Amino acid sequence: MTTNVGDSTLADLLDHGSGLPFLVQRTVARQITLLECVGKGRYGEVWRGSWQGENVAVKIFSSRDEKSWFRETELYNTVMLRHENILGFIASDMTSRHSTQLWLITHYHEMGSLYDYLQLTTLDTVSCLRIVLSIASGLAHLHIEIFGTQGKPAIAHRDLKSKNILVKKNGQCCIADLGLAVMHSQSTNQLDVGNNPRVGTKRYMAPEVLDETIQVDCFDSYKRVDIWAFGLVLWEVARRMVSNGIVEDYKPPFYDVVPNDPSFEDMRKVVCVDQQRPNIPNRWFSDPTLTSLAKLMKECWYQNPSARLTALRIKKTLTKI
Amino acid sequence: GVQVETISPGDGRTFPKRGQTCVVHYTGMLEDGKKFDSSRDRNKPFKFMLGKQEVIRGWEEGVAQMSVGQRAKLTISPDYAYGATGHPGIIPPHATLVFDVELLKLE
Ligand SMILES: c1ccc2c(-c3coc4cc(-c5ccc(N6CCNCC6)cc5)cnc34)ccnc2c1
Numbered sequence: 001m002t003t004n005v006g007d008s009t010l011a012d013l014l015d016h017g018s019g020l021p022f023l024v025q026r027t028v029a030r031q032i033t034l035l036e037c038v039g040k041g042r043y044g045e046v047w048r049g050s051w052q053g054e055n056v057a058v059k060i061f062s063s064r065d066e067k068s069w070f071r072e073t074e075l076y077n078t079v080m081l082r083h084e085n086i087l088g089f090i091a092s093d094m095t096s097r098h099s100t101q102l103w104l105i106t107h108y109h110e111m112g113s114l115y116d117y118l119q120l121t122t123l124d125t126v127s128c129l130r131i132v133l134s135i136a137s138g139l140a141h142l143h144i145e146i147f148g149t150q151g152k153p154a155i156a157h158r159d160l161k162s163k164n165i166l167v168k169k170n171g172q173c174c175i176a177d178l179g180l181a182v183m184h185s186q187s188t189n190q191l192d193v194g195n196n197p198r199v200g201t202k203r204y205m206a207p208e209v210l211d212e213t214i215q216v217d218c219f220d221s222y223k224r225v226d227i228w229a230f231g232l233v234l235w236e237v238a239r240r241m242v243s244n245g246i247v248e249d250y251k252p253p254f255y256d257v258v259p260n261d262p263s264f265e266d267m268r269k270v271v272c273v274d275q276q277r278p279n280i281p282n283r284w285f286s287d288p289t290l291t292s293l294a295k296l297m298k299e300c301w302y303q304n305p306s307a308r309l310t311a312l313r314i315k316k317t318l319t320k321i
Numbered sequence: 322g323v324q325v326e327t328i329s330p331g332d333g334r335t336f337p338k339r340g341q342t343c344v345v346h347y348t349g350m351l352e353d354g355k356k357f358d359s360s361r362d363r364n365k366p367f368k369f370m371l372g373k374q375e376v377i378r379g380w381e382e383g384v385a386q387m388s389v390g391q392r393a394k395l396t397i398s399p400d401y402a403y404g405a406t407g408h409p410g411i412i413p414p415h416a417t418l419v420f421d422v423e424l425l426k427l428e
């Protein structure tokens with residue numbers, strides 16, 4: 001074998017910020033061998049890489065999205081964010097050759113995003129609850145503030161969607177992409193919004209965002225945007241659960257009323273002017289699991305943001321199902 | 322560029338060459354004394370290959386002037402370190418760096 005005495009795995013180097021030690025981040029980054037391109041978009045590219053035979057995910061940002069790479073790198077390096085349902089951060093690096101390249105290295109999840117997973121596979125009661133409860137547990141971990149040295153401030157994602165949720169090998173999910181995140185500390189009540197010209201996904205935008213009525217100086221408003229988007233993700237997942245031999249094809253939220261890559265006015269007319277919500281199929285109430293999920297979606301879609309459930313309330317309900 | 326202040330001498334004969342792996346113990350500090358990284362705190366030596374650009378330029382040119390067993394003080398200038406961008410959340414822009422590095426062995 002190619003193993004020599006003193007070789008360390010990634011798990012050994014990570015045991016120590018959320019990822020590797022600072023100087024170790026640069027060494028591991030520039031020893032990664034890119035293998036296959038698994039994503040490409042306005043954000044940049046996502047590559048499956050390899051460090052010492054171990055799979056890793058490498059997000060190579062575009063020059064227009066440098067502020068998202070800054071926020072996610074700053075967040076992961078300053079806040080201890082290690083959780084089963086949050087994407088595991090490994091390292092962040094920048095190179096001045098090939099002009100500049102910005103790299104974010106995370107765990108690699110071969111199943112891909114929840115968006116891709118739901119299009120190929122159907123679910124049962126066990127796999128649906130595992131997916132849905134994991135997202136709630138990761139979102140609740142982000143929203144709740146933990147005190148102490150190993151603690152974390154309250155965090156809101158602000159771009160939660162099935163494409164930003166990865167399916168792990170054990171069937172659970174993890175939340176990714178913290179470039180639009182905001183922070184809040186209860187000790188000083190300060191809100192950290194950041195500096196990023198990136199806008200959220202319009203299809204998942206909450207009503208208070210589309211009519212510009214959201215209270216931008218209140219951290220609770222950003223958490224309730226996540227709950228709205230989470231409810232739409234619940235609607236995507238529950239469609240793929242089989243009950244009585246019936247299942248729905250995968251469809252994005254509002255597939256039947258807006259086109260692909262919708263505009264602000266497309267969403268504002270559907271969500272705000274017409275007050276439309278995704279339709280709940282009637283066959284779901286013949287199944288106790290989808291009945292509980294249907295009840296949770298409607299409680300994420302209240303026009304009044306304060307009426308929506310909390311991420312912690314959703315996890316407790318899913319734990320009892 | 323990079324200032325090398327010797328703390329304890331090495332053998333004075335074995336200096337790192339291109340391709341060799343440098344096994345070091347280090348403690349990184351800002352010029353205000355704030356420590357941001359230390360291999361000593363975790364009792365795990367740090368390894369890197371000279372000439373592969375796996376560390377900052379000040380580390381390469383600084384460790385290349387040390388002998389095995391030497392403990393040196395490396396004061397790295399921003400242009401030899403992380404420059405104007407730095408590292409978000411660890412290294413501020415235009416940060417002058419102070420490294421307590423001991424070259425343990427070469428492989
Ligand atoms: C947001 C979302 C993911 C990430 C990731 C990331 C971590 O792990 C990842 C795995 C994939 C992937 C997707 C599809 C397939 N395919 C699809 C077709 N069928 C076979 C599997 C494989 C891998 C993508 N991104 C990441 C890294 C950094 N920032 C992100 C921000």
Ligand SMILES: [F-]
Pocket residue numbers: 161163201203
């Ligand atoms: F999307």
